[PDB]
Design a protein around this ligand. Structure first.
Ligand SMILES: CC(C)(C#Cc1ccc(-c2ccc(Cl)c3c(NS(=O)(=O)C4CC4)nn(CC(F)F)c23)c([C@H](Cc2cc(F)cc(F)c2)NC(=O)Cn2nc(C(F)F)c3c2C(F)(F)[C@@H]2C[C@H]32)n1)S(C)(=O)=O
Ligand SMILES: CC(C)(C#Cc1ccc(-c2ccc(Cl)c3c(NS(=O)(=O)C4CC4)nn(CC(F)F)c23)c([C@H](Cc2cc(F)cc(F)c2)NC(=O)Cn2nc(C(F)F)c3c2C(F)(F)[C@@H]2C[C@H]32)n1)S(C)(=O)=O
Ligand SMILES: CC(C)(C#Cc1ccc(-c2ccc(Cl)c3c(NS(=O)(=O)C4CC4)nn(CC(F)F)c23)c([C@H](Cc2cc(F)cc(F)c2)NC(=O)Cn2nc(C(F)F)c3c2C(F)(F)[C@@H]2C[C@H]32)n1)S(C)(=O)=O
Ligand SMILES: CC(C)(C#Cc1ccc(-c2ccc(Cl)c3c(NS(=O)(=O)C4CC4)nn(CC(F)F)c23)c([C@H](Cc2cc(F)cc(F)c2)NC(=O)Cn2nc(C(F)F)c3c2C(F)(F)[C@@H]2C[C@H]32)n1)S(C)(=O)=O
Ligand SMILES: CC(C)(C#Cc1ccc(-c2ccc(Cl)c3c(NS(=O)(=O)C4CC4)nn(CC(F)F)c23)c([C@H](Cc2cc(F)cc(F)c2)NC(=O)Cn2nc(C(F)F)c3c2C(F)(F)[C@@H]2C[C@H]32)n1)S(C)(=O)=O
Lengths: 200, 202, 201, 193, 196
């Protein structure tokens, strides 16, 4: 991070604990983006290395980083190439110069964008169930069904405009017969609080 | 957060996630949240709310409550002035929020967004404990300590007015107790403090 | 706290919550509390007590003890002077507390912490119902575990340090199971705990 | 670490928690290297002492440190720092502070990291060629184990493509053979899911 | 510490360490590192927060009393007595004065010496088995046997020749033969690789 303080312990320890506990859920992307503020490519690589397990997801993230680096190289101190942004062929001093020079070339931000895109891909892939396939079970409380529905919806990552249409149609459509009837009788526009209180 | 523009510290986010994971949604989550988000800007509050794993239904209800409060703000309040969606950090850059919060007289957008979030959290906590104070009753072979713990947890979750707190706590504790401990407590005499009651019922 | 009025730090609250959750209510919670709340204002102490999950009965008893101490203060002690409910932070703004504690040469925060510590001592004494005289070594229980339980109950009781020596010396040997009782009686007077445990283990 | 403030608690505590939870996996090397920034030899020894358990791995690390110290003494015959001076066994804190304020810390950390790499390679006994998908084993878990072993062993990339076909259960073997060459890992896993 | 009160993170980490590791040798360096410049009151606060193991804490208190009596015999603001070093009969102001006076009276260092001696005793008591009694089991992996052997060695805190010969001596028949055939001077990595 940029002075140029070395990545703090607490940050790495918390990042490791997060990736271990939460597995790969949408909350890993904001957490990551918040723990890697102003981080240089070397620091981002140190963060990604400390990730235990999930090595398939890490390999897929590395593949996405290589794809973005190839695209950068095709479209484009010395100028930074694609593998230069990923911190494979650039010293910490070169990165510090690139990011601190005036005008600056924020290589850290670019690498973090690539990593966050890869993480979005990973999150979408770790939630295989589609919005249209989730339906309330027979003897399943409505709360658990709503939780699963909204978790899958956040994993899919569709535009908020489509978010509203899906939230309103699919939630009512896939409800079990009892709660389906209760909700259909509740009336249109019924807020989520009213539905949850009615079904409980 | 502001205290310059320091980025939200790691410890804060990590502890907030750990709290929301461990305690689920209990009354102690509201003070914890309010204490971990001191001087936090709207973007930081949204970063905190995003890191909350699971409980996505409660987060949707919180978002709906925030939209309601924002509509009310816009109705009451038609650099530039901050609109409703600017307080919630949906249509305002970090620089605009910092400018609003650093001016004098400052427009504390952070405090307002935190008020809205705390109202939503009160709703969530009250809804996650569906049993009412008047519906909670001591079991047959349940020690008095466990019944008192459940009773006071439900009472703090309902969070009504203080007069309710005192009257309900003592009257309902004696009323809903099991027959044996009910008799023991009624024999203890009026004014009985909780310590004496627990010592008698053990 | 006033070190300027710094807000209660996150790490402190998180460690306090984790401590109260893991250890339940054991004597070691009181020193921990007193050490984590240095110079804390009444609002900060209330924030700490609020974040305590579960154990709501003990917290209500603590609130009742705080009310008792506030009533005693109000009786003994009739900006303005702080009444009982002002010390507990129920009828005083953060600014009034900061002024009271920062005025040269009345640290109300320390007083509120004294009250809370008295309440916590009562709570700890109540959470250990067994008395020192009721603890006795089991049939096939290692001597180390019996000593651990004995000294845990002794620290929980919070009696006068005067009775500590008499009880530790007489009762520890008295409440031992027959085999280790004979071994220790043969060890001879003036033995240290290390020697006793080495002999029994 | 270089003023010379004493090693902070948080660093030691996180190091202990990491070494305990993750045992000895490749992710321990970056963690160690990041937690010991500017640390003096005494600080590195304080870190190594607090490591609970895994005493066999710690003894192997100590032997590797002695080997590297002997090699240093052979290559390199205030005063000059000997081998046992870098390892902090025959040097006072003041001499270390003077030398680093000759980066003894970086050299000692290089030795320790080499030993830790050896330890990690030894903690993963399974070879890349022995891992094969089970009968009722999800493909994701098989891929995770494969890449974990590959990272532990530290050509590899070329081998990955052959091993993918090799470690494929008959059903998944047919699916992969039909998928066609040059299939990316994302596409491959999406097809096999 | 040197006089801010002991920070939260330090106390919380100390409690978690004493809980997790129980009483193992690695607790002594950790303790010595967490109490740098700590006053006697801070050391007492650290020792109080230790949950459980109250027998070991009583033994530590007895060791502290022994060392305080020895000090009082050897050395018969005011001069610090035995109970003054342990923070039992001295106010925070007296400790701050003793430690801040130009002639350093290290109450922290002396109390920490006493506490570390007691803790070494406790650790030695928690590992009753001797190095010469440890032997590889019938169906026990060689790695676990080496780990137990070296843990016991660290508990004994007594060396290289004996440890290395006894390691091969106390092995299981199969691994004993394998190691004896491996040849002298083989490193532990090679031995473990052969026995794997
Ligand atoms: C990328 C960064 C910089 C960011 C951000 C950012 C900015 C604004 C908002 C935000 C704040 C307040 C409101 Cl009112 C709305 C809102 N209202 S609205 O009804 O759409 C109507 C106005 C159109 N929309 N947004 C998202 C915006 F993009 F429009 C809002 C958000 C909010 C923060 C938030 C989360 C939460 F849990 C509860 C809560 F109170 C607020 N994030 C999301 O809600 C994310 N999410 N998306 C969905 C979708 F799957 F359904 C869902 C959520 C879920 F909430 F988790 C809940 C599962 C359903 N983050 S960074 C690194 O910091 O991550
Ligand atoms: C919103 C913020 C700013 C706040 C606050 C604030 C202010 C004052 C007090 C407080 C302090 C001292 C006293 Cl003596 C009383 C008191 N005495 S009284 O008997 O009512 C009689 C005088 C009328 N009342 N109050 C609450 C006040 F609002 F009246 C008192 C409190 C106290 C702090 C406290 C909690 C605790 F656990 C133990 C303890 F020692 C003290 N909070 C509550 O007690 C909250 N609570 N409410 C109830 C109800 F379900 F029964 C219960 C509690 C429970 F304690 F958790 C316990 C389950 C039963 N918080 S913030 C962000 O920091 O949250
Ligand atoms: C209130 C505050 C400010 C305090 C304090 C304070 C002051 C002095 C001492 C202390 C230090 C050194 C020694 Cl030698 C003695 C000692 N020697 S003596 O044999 O009594 C003989 C001289 C008469 N007595 N004291 C207590 C004093 F008050 F006299 C000693 C202590 C010590 C600190 C300590 C704890 C420990 F775990 C191990 C250890 F090494 C030292 N605390 C106690 O021992 C507490 N305790 N009390 C008993 C009783 F149930 F048996 C027991 C303990 C138990 F240890 F936990 C162990 C279970 C048995 N704390 S605060 C906020 O910081 O809490
Ligand atoms: C008291 C303080 C200040 C200290 C210290 C200090 C100083 C030097 C060394 C040290 C550093 C490098 C080397 Cl090469 C050797 C070495 N090489 S040698 O083969 O003996 C041959 C030269 C004679 N000896 N020493 C110890 C010295 F005293 F001689 C070495 C050590 C080292 C640090 C270290 C630990 C580790 F885990 C792995 C590692 F790589 C290095 N500590 C020990 O090893 C401690 N230990 N002792 C034994 C005994 F039971 F077998 C064992 C260990 C065990 F390692 F845990 C492993 C279980 C077997 N600490 S403080 C507060 O910071 O604690
Ligand atoms: C020693 C220090 C200083 C370091 C470092 C350093 C430098 C560059 C890179 C790096 C960054 C970006 C890219 Cl694109 C590549 C890349 N692309 S490539 O496909 O090889 C093709 C270009 C040739 N290779 N490298 C490694 C380089 F050395 F070549 C890349 C790395 C990266 C950082 C990273 C880790 C991750 F989890 C996901 C991710 F996105 C990126 N580390 C590794 O990937 C390590 N690893 N090695 C293998 C091997 F078993 F297969 C595997 C990984 C695994 F990723 F974990 C995944 C299991 C498979 N670390 S320190 C103290 O900080 O540790």
């Amino acid at each position: 991070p940029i002075v140029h303080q070395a990545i703090s312990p607490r940050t790495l320890c918390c990042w490791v604990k997060v990736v271990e506990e939460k597995a790969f859920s949408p909350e890993v992307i904001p957490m990551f983006s918040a723990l890697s503020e102003g981080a240089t490519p070397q620091d981002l690589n140190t963060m990604l290395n400390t990730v235990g397990g999930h090595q398939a997801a890490m390999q897929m993230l590395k593949e996405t980083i290589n794809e973005e680096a190839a695209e950068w190289d095709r479209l484009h101190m010395r100028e930074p190439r694609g593998s230069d942004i990923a911190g494979t062929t650039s010293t910490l001093q070169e990165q510090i110069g690139w990011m601190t020079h005036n005008p600056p070339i924020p290589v850290g931000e670019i690498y973090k964008r690539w990593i966050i895109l890869g993480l979005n891909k990973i999150v979408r892939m770790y939630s295989p169930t589609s919005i249209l396939d989730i339906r309330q079970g027979p003897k399943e409380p409505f709360r658990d069904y709503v939780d699963r529905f909204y978790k899958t919806l956040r994993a899919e990552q569709a535009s908020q405009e489509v978010k509203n249409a899906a939230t309103e149609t699919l939630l009512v459509q896939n409800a079990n017969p009892d709660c389906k009837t209760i909700l259909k009788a509740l009336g249109p526009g019924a807020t989520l609080e009213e539905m949850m209180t009615a079904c409980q």
